[model samples]
Every structure is written in C-alpha cells, then in structure tokens.
Target: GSSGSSGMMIRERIEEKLRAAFQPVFLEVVDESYRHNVPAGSESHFKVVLVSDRFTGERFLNRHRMIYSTLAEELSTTVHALALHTYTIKEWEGLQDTVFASPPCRG
Candidate 1:
C-alpha cells in the first residue's frame, strides 16, 4: 500500500529513485507513516535497508552522504525521516540477520 498527498505515489518514487542510484543486491523500503504524527495517507517517514558492492569501501558518514545525495529531492519535499541500513555484499552476507523494525513513536 502507498500513501501520498497527491495522486503520485511517494513510496514507489522512493524505490524507483533508490534502484536507479544504488543498484542494490538487496533493497527494502518500508513506509512508516503510521508510526508518525502526520495525517492519514502521508508518505512522510521510511526505513531503507540496502546491500550493494557500491558501499564496499565507503565510510559510515560517506554511506549516509551518498544516500542523502541520492534522495536529495525527496528529502527536500515529502520524506520527513529515513532510517538507513547500508552494507556491502560481504558485510550483508556475514550478518546473522538484517531485521529492521521501527520503534513506537514518542510523540
């Protein structure tokens, strides 16, 4: 399911942008608007987990920087927050699990 202010679907837009940018071996984009204070059908929050060889030699800051740069347009507009979990192919394979669940909203 998708939720957006207009007819355009923001969640699909996010997935599309990320696919074009990262070319991840694994990618998961979870819409977390239900956990926020936004009105119904607002695509304002998300969690993105991605694994790709592109991040093989990047530092933590650089990884986030890359994601932010890739999603600059969305960050400036509909997207309010993003929880990112980026990993290299080896790092992702070595992980016991990559389960990401959003915590309950404080506000």
Candidate 2:
C-alpha cells in the first residue's frame, strides 16, 4: 500500500515540521537529489541553513541533538543524507555569505 506521494511533497512536510519545531528566523533547504542520483519519488540528500534563537548559547553537538530530536522519525526512516548549517540568529547575521559545495573531483 502507498500514499502516492512525491518527493517534494515529503520534503515540504519535513521542512514545515522543522520550521514549526525550531521557529527559525532564517532557513533554506537545498535538495541535492541530482548529485546523489536518487530515483524518482525519493529524497535522499539535503543541505539546510537554519538560524534561530533556539541555538543560542548551545554547544554545537547539543544544537545538532536538538534538531535530531525534532526530526527523530525522519532521521530514523525518511532521510539518508543531511548537511545542517545551524547558527544562532546573532551568529547567523554576523556570518556573511552562504556555503557553496566544492567542485567535483577531476579524476
């Protein structure tokens, strides 16, 4: 049995849940599906940029844990790859420019 869902639909559901849980001030979700060669209807890779008061004064590991907790189910089942860019609102504002992916190997 299947719900006949799309990957973008699932991705949006995950993003909405995260936003509601964290109440982040800034957020960007980059779908790296093409890079991973995922089959249609699959979402296996992502890069996320998120800034929130929730991260204030938290250690890096703890902050990651918080996110992991919020997404426990997804981490357990839905997503296979994730790159999280997390920061406090102040820290995020202080940092300039988005992170870019490195070029592919020439070999």
Candidate 3:
C-alpha cells in the first residue's frame, strides 16, 4: 500500500497566508463549514478576524481586497465563503468580538 502525502488544512493555510502577509498582532481563523449546506468535514465556510498594523491608515475595503488576492487560489477551488473582520489593534481592543454572522444555509 502506498501512503499519500497530505496537505495542510484550509484554516491552517489561511492562518499562514495572513500571518505572512500582515504579520498580524492577533489572528484567528475559524472553520464554520459545519454551519453550511456542504458535505461533512468539508473546509468551505470560514471566518477570519485579524488585527495588524499593516491595515493602519488604509481604507476599509482595500484590506479585504488584499486578503482576497492572497487567497485567490483557495477561493477558485474549495473555499465557498469567507467572513473577514480585519481590524487594527486599537479598533480591535474597542470591539473584540465584533464579527459578521453568516446566514443560515437552506440549500
């Protein structure tokens, strides 16, 4: 029997990319795939909340654009949804748990 080499999990990959790009002061990548209408144990839905100095003085939406570009390959493939909550440490301190709730899946 041949043993196959396995790749990293989606959440781990997202964590790595964001950490590498932003050098986040704080970062959390959560898999919410269980909340979606997909196969069991799938890595599709996600919520990423990261605080970084890189976003300091930047426009709100462009931060998202950067993240999207960083994860383009994953987005084109298995990633179905992402709830991004990019923040600076100052803003994050004021609103620690603020995050967008994904809509309940019906499909």
Candidate 4:
C-alpha cells in the first residue's frame, strides 16, 4: 500500500508543474541522486526533457526561466539542481538523440 512519502516526492511535483504549465508533448523527470553519490534514495538532482509548443519561439534562457519560476517553491526548498532540455516539437523531431549527460559527483 502507498504511504504519505514517495520514492521521490519532489520529482512528482516537478512533473506535475511542468505538464500543467507547458502541456508538453513529451516530458521526463529523472531522479539522479544515486548517480551523484549522495545519500541513498535522496531526491536532490533531476533532469527534465520537455517538448512543448509553448517553447516555439522562446529564447533559450527564457525557456528555463519560465520553468524555474514555475518550480520556484521546489527550488527554494528541496531541489538542489535541475538539468533541462527544452524543445519545440520540430526541434525535438529533428534531434537524432535525446541524450543528456552530467559529470559524476565531483565532491
């Protein structure tokens, strides 16, 4: 049975906010705490791949700003870092790969 806590609570919040804000055609939220060599099961770092028509003509940085603002509460609270790949439908289709890589924990 499910309880009050989730495996990754902040991750779920992020997915909900972005989906509602952008109505993305595609969206993915990755829990990356293990990869960062942090405490087990921690929900600190995340990666988001979102494809939305709303980002059609938006400037590169503004797209992120919009997302950042939308997720302000999380950032101010639990989210330590966020990796984002924002794309318009055409941009997403043209991409041969939807791959993003982050360096291993540097600390």
Best candidate according to TM-score: 4
Q: Candidate 4: what lDDT?
A: 0.75
Candidate 1 segments exceeding 4 Å error: 1-7, 35-45, 97-107
| Model 3 pairs in collision | none
Where is model 2 more than 4 Å wrong at Cα? 1-8, 35-44, 97-107
By TM-score rank, best first, the candidates go 4, 1, 3, 2
Q: lDDT for each of the candidates?
A: 0.74, 0.71, 0.75, 0.75
> For residues 11-37, could you state the per-residue lDDT of candidate 3 as single tens digits?
888888877876768888777535547
lDDT of 2 at 13: 64
- Which pairs, if any, clash in model 2? none
Estimate the TM-score of every prediction.
0.65, 0.63, 0.64, 0.66
Model 3: runs farther than 4 Å from truth?
1-7, 35-44, 96-107
Candidate 3, residue 33: Cα displacement in angstroms equals: 3.9
lDDT score of residue 99 within candidate 1: 58
Q: Flag the better candidate by lDDT, 3 or 4.
A: 3
